[PDB]
Symmetry: C2
Subunit: 96 residues, 2 copies
Amino acid sequence: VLDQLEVAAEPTRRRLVQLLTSGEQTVNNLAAHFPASRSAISQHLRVLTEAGLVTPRKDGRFRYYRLDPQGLAQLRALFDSFWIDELDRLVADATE
Amino acid sequence: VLDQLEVAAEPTRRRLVQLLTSGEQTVNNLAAHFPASRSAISQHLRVLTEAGLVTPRKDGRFRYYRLDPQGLAQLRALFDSFWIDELDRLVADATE
Ligand SMILES: [Mg+2]
Ligand SMILES: [Mg+2]
């Protein structure tokens, strides 16, 4: 089945999730933040919907998407179980 | 170019990164933790290498991989910039 963290981590999908934090929005309005087409953004939103991260609603000529807390909680759980302590310890070893 | 968070988030790659926290390991030894073939695991390790998350070394008949802190620091930075406050607030709205 779809893993929420794998799906969400795609960089356009990350940005779509951030954009939706300001509330439910139309496909066309979200799509205006990217060089990619409406159709491209629509397909990313369908993938996020299948993963349980966003939820669609239709009202007339607009399709709206909003974040689903249920999916976000599973996303955060997957990242928390992935990111074990030694990974934080290694990050602290990094130079720049 | 490769985004470390997108690459790392693939579920086999997440587990390979966790496994490597116990130290540098051979391809065959890592591969023994999964139903997938050596060849499959080898290819995931090549992707992680290209993303700067792991580093290869050859000694005789073994190829060894180890975590690269430089890549892990960028991975953690990408997740931290993605996961904005409102996402934590929404996770707290989730039921179960
Ligand atoms: Mg809601
Ligand atoms: Mg090292």
